[PDB]
Design an enzyme around this catalytic site. Sequence first.
Site, PDB file in Angstrom:
ATOM      1  N   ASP A  35       0.975   7.325  -1.957  1.00  0.00           N
ATOM      2  CA  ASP A  35       0.799   7.456  -0.514  1.00  0.00           C
ATOM      3  C   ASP A  35      -0.637   7.660  -0.037  1.00  0.00           C
ATOM      4  O   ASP A  35      -1.184   8.764  -0.122  1.00  0.00           O
ATOM      5  CB  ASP A  35       1.700   8.594  -0.017  1.00  0.00           C
ATOM      6  N   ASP A 220      -1.732   3.140   5.617  1.00  0.00           N
ATOM      7  CA  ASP A 220      -0.762   4.050   5.040  1.00  0.00           C
ATOM      8  C   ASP A 220       0.300   3.410   4.130  1.00  0.00           C
ATOM      9  O   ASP A 220       1.287   2.859   4.616  1.00  0.00           O
ATOM     10  CB  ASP A 220      -0.095   4.760   6.217  1.00  0.00           C
TER      11      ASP A 220
HETATM   12  C1  LIG Z   1       8.197   5.713   1.495  1.00  0.00           C
HETATM   13  C2  LIG Z   1       8.429   4.997   2.843  1.00  0.00           C
HETATM   14  C3  LIG Z   1       9.452   5.760   3.723  1.00  0.00           C
HETATM   15  C4  LIG Z   1       9.770   5.071   5.063  1.00  0.00           C
HETATM   16  C5  LIG Z   1      11.329   4.880   5.396  1.00  0.00           C
HETATM   17  C6  LIG Z   1      12.271   6.057   5.901  1.00  0.00           C
HETATM   18  C7  LIG Z   1      13.668   5.609   6.452  1.00  0.00           C
HETATM   19  S1  LIG Z   1       8.753   5.740   6.467  1.00  0.00           S
HETATM   20  O1  LIG Z   1       9.696   6.187   7.464  1.00  0.00           O
HETATM   21  O2  LIG Z   1       7.871   4.707   6.931  1.00  0.00           O
HETATM   22  C8  LIG Z   1       7.685   7.127   5.968  1.00  0.00           C
HETATM   23  C9  LIG Z   1       6.766   7.622   7.080  1.00  0.00           C
HETATM   24  N1  LIG Z   1       7.585   7.872   8.204  1.00  0.00           N
HETATM   25  C10 LIG Z   1       7.585   7.163   9.409  1.00  0.00           C
HETATM   26  O3  LIG Z   1       6.846   6.201   9.618  1.00  0.00           O
HETATM   27  O4  LIG Z   1       8.503   7.640  10.308  1.00  0.00           O
HETATM   28  C11 LIG Z   1       8.664   7.043  11.607  1.00  0.00           C
HETATM   29  C12 LIG Z   1       9.743   7.765  12.362  1.00  0.00           C
HETATM   30  C13 LIG Z   1      11.095   7.191  12.459  1.00  0.00           C
HETATM   31  C14 LIG Z   1      12.130   7.898  13.185  1.00  0.00           C
HETATM   32  C15 LIG Z   1      11.837   9.168  13.816  1.00  0.00           C
HETATM   33  C16 LIG Z   1      10.498   9.735  13.721  1.00  0.00           C
HETATM   34  C17 LIG Z   1       9.462   9.036  13.000  1.00  0.00           C
HETATM   35  C18 LIG Z   1       5.988   8.793   6.545  1.00  0.00           C
HETATM   36  O5  LIG Z   1       6.153   9.864   7.173  1.00  0.00           O
HETATM   37  N2  LIG Z   1       5.202   8.652   5.469  1.00  0.00           N
HETATM   38  C19 LIG Z   1       4.409   9.680   4.809  1.00  0.00           C
HETATM   39  C20 LIG Z   1       4.842   9.640   3.317  1.00  0.00           C
HETATM   40  C21 LIG Z   1       6.351   9.877   3.063  1.00  0.00           C
HETATM   41  C22 LIG Z   1       7.043   9.178   1.960  1.00  0.00           C
HETATM   42  C23 LIG Z   1       8.481   9.391   1.727  1.00  0.00           C
HETATM   43  C24 LIG Z   1       9.241  10.302   2.594  1.00  0.00           C
HETATM   44  C25 LIG Z   1       8.568  10.996   3.685  1.00  0.00           C
HETATM   45  C26 LIG Z   1       7.143  10.793   3.923  1.00  0.00           C
HETATM   46  C27 LIG Z   1       2.902   9.427   4.994  1.00  0.00           C
HETATM   47  O6  LIG Z   1       2.170  10.416   4.321  1.00  0.00           O
HETATM   48  C28 LIG Z   1       2.509   9.528   6.451  1.00  0.00           C
HETATM   49  N3  LIG Z   1       1.033   9.327   6.644  1.00  0.00           N
HETATM   50  C29 LIG Z   1       0.607   9.502   8.042  1.00  0.00           C
HETATM   51  C30 LIG Z   1       0.834  11.014   8.331  1.00  0.00           C
HETATM   52  C31 LIG Z   1       1.518  11.455   9.560  1.00  0.00           C
HETATM   53  C32 LIG Z   1       1.745  12.886   9.814  1.00  0.00           C
HETATM   54  C33 LIG Z   1       1.298  13.897   8.845  1.00  0.00           C
HETATM   55  C34 LIG Z   1       0.605  13.486   7.590  1.00  0.00           C
HETATM   56  O7  LIG Z   1       0.169  14.377   6.615  1.00  0.00           O
HETATM   57  C35 LIG Z   1      -1.103  14.283   5.917  1.00  0.00           C
HETATM   58  C36 LIG Z   1       0.391  12.046   7.369  1.00  0.00           C
END
Ligand SMILES: CCCC(CCC)S(=O)(=O)C[C@@H](NC(=O)OCc1ccccc1)C(=O)N[C@@H](Cc1ccccc1)[C@H](O)CNCc1cccc(OC)c1
Length: 371
Positions: A35, A220
């Site tokens: 990640d 990302d």
């Molecule tokens: C592995 C792909 C899962 C997808 C599929 C799920 C059905 S996803 O959904 O695209 C994952 C995304 N989630 C996402 O895009 O969610 C969108 C959403 C959908 C519905 C409701 C709310 C949000 C996400 O949060 N990703 C973080 C890695 C992670 C990996 C596995 C599980 C939880 C998290 C990453 O690090 C974020 N980087 C920016 C970031 C942001 C904030 C604070 C941070 O800390 C340093 C950093």
Amino acid sequence: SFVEMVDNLRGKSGQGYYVEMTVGSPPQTLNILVDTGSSNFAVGAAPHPFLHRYYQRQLSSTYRDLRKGVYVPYTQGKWEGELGTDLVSIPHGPNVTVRANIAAITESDKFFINGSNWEGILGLAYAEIARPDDSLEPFFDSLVKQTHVPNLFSLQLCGASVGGSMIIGGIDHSLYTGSLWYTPIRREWYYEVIIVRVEINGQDLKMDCKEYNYDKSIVDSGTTNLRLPKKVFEAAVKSIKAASSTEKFPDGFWLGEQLVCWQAGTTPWNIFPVISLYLMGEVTNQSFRITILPQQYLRPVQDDCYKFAISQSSTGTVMGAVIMEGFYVVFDRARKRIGFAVSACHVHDEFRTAAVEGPFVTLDMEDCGYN
Ligand SMILES: CCCC(CCC)S(=O)(=O)C[C@@H](NC(=O)OCc1ccccc1)C(=O)N[C@@H](Cc1ccccc1)[C@H](O)CNCc1cccc(OC)c1
């Protein structure tokens, strides 16, 4: 570069790419999600319905409790745990071992995915965004300070089960074609980049480039979709809908809710437009563009079914995994820049092809960054 790391990534569509690692002494093997969207190295350290295995600190003669708790809230999902250090290794990566910070996940909520096959997450971004604070050195930083591994890494994410490569410490020239193009890393917290222009099937979106980076834009690998600011997201969809207005789809589809399907092999790719994202270059008034094919933003899930992989954000643009799949991305930390080049595992289309092209003139690119 390195032959031993070439096919070191796996994972299934929409559920992230992972690399094999070992923590503890003796070595405990765990699949860790790659990640570039965060900066904390964290692994399950307790039973959970979705974990097939987890880090057992009691069985590691090298574990050391830092006696500090920690929690990380992601866009969607969060975990809680305990900070400690141990020795870590990447079997199909460089040939070294380092003592790194590790967040032993004790509790989690909508983090672990059912059937993903990974039990941890490796945040490769900068300390500035780590938890509890920037004093918790991220894994890569440790790797770079403790070994001779150069301060750089490249990711080759391939679409489909799914595979790819993470080249720790260099660039493997056998994974891409054409010229590598670089965009500066605006600031070292997330892998922030500045988007200067956006085109759908050749038509400029005509928006104020500040909108493209409203809040910020990041690369990302931890995110699946291409995430766009509200205004940009609405313009894109409108443009994409019109392009494919030959057929009609439910609103739930454009919202990423319900999927769409076509008789096997009859997907109307031709009616879906290509999206060009122009990034700031390395030279004055110079930019370049990467072009995404619909095969990239229509994620596959009898018939061929797909999910619209572009969704709106309230935290800036997010060049997710689907954007990275068509290319070889170089995270040149040492020279504060990110490189793009057509991937060996590029996407296909008999009449269209993803690309990375330059140079392009773009005046006032600085005004594109948000403040
Ligand atoms: C592995 C792909 C899962 C997808 C599929 C799920 C059905 S996803 O959904 O695209 C994952 C995304 N989630 C996402 O895009 O969610 C969108 C959403 C959908 C519905 C409701 C709310 C949000 C996400 O949060 N990703 C973080 C890695 C992670 C990996 C596995 C599980 C939880 C998290 C990453 O690090 C974020 N980087 C920016 C970031 C942001 C904030 C604070 C941070 O800390 C340093 C950093």
